[PDB]
């Protein structure tokens, strides 16, 4: 799916990503055991990478606005929750929040006039 996105097929890849992460969450819910818990850590890593890609691709497609910011924020928060010790996830989450701050500042300036 990363290759699909790199092939310019964006919307379909993103929808597939949503479906795949939902399925992967369902599988996690189905996953309860010790060695299965290790596979669940692997699941968390993979699906946190996935959530980061969901946030990034939704940002790229739908741009930045009041409606889009909550969804990507939710994706990145989920990614951080899945892996708290991944630099990319936390950096992306902070970058998104900072961009939201800048966006609201810009609309403050617009509202001033």
Residue at token pair 């929040």: 97
Burial 47-59 (b: 16+ CB within 10 A, else e): bbbbbbbbbbbbb
Residue at token pair 């369902």: 26
- Could you tell me which residues are annotated as the binding site? 2, 49
- Could you tell me which residues are annotated as the binding site for 1D-myo-inositol hexakisphosphate? 2, 49
Q: Contact at 8 Å (CB) between 68 and 62?
A: yes
Technique used to solve these coordinates: cryo-EM
64: DSSP letter? S
Distance CA 91, CA 5 (A): 22
Q: Contact at 8 Å (CB) between 64 and 98?
A: no
Distance CA 110, CA 52 (A): 31
Distance (Å) of CA 55 to CA 20, 35, 48, 59, 102: 14, 30, 11, 6, 18
Distance (Å) of CA 80 to CA 45, 71, 87, 92: 10, 14, 9, 9
Q: Contact at 8 Å (CB) between 79 and 56?
A: no
What is the distance of C-alpha 28 from the center of its chain? 17
Resolution of the structure, angstroms: 3.6
């Amino acid at each position: 799916m990363k290759n699909m996105w790199k092939s310019a097929r964006k919307i379909d890849a993103f929808q597939h990503m949503q479906h795949f992460v939902q399925t992967m969450q369902q599988q996690a819910q189905h996953a309860i055991a010790t060695e299965d818990q290790q596979h669940k850590q692997e699941l968390h890593k993979l699906m946190a990478r996935c959530f980061l890609k969901l946030g990034e691709w939704q940002l790229n497609l739908q741009g930045i606005n009041e409606s889009t910011i909550p969804k990507v924020l939710q994706y990145y928060s989920a990614a951080t929750e899945h892996d708290r010790s991944w630099y990319k996830a936390w950096h992306a989450w902070a970058v998104m929040n900072f961009e939201a701050v800048l966006h609201y500042k810009h609309q403050n300036q617009a509202r001033d006039e």
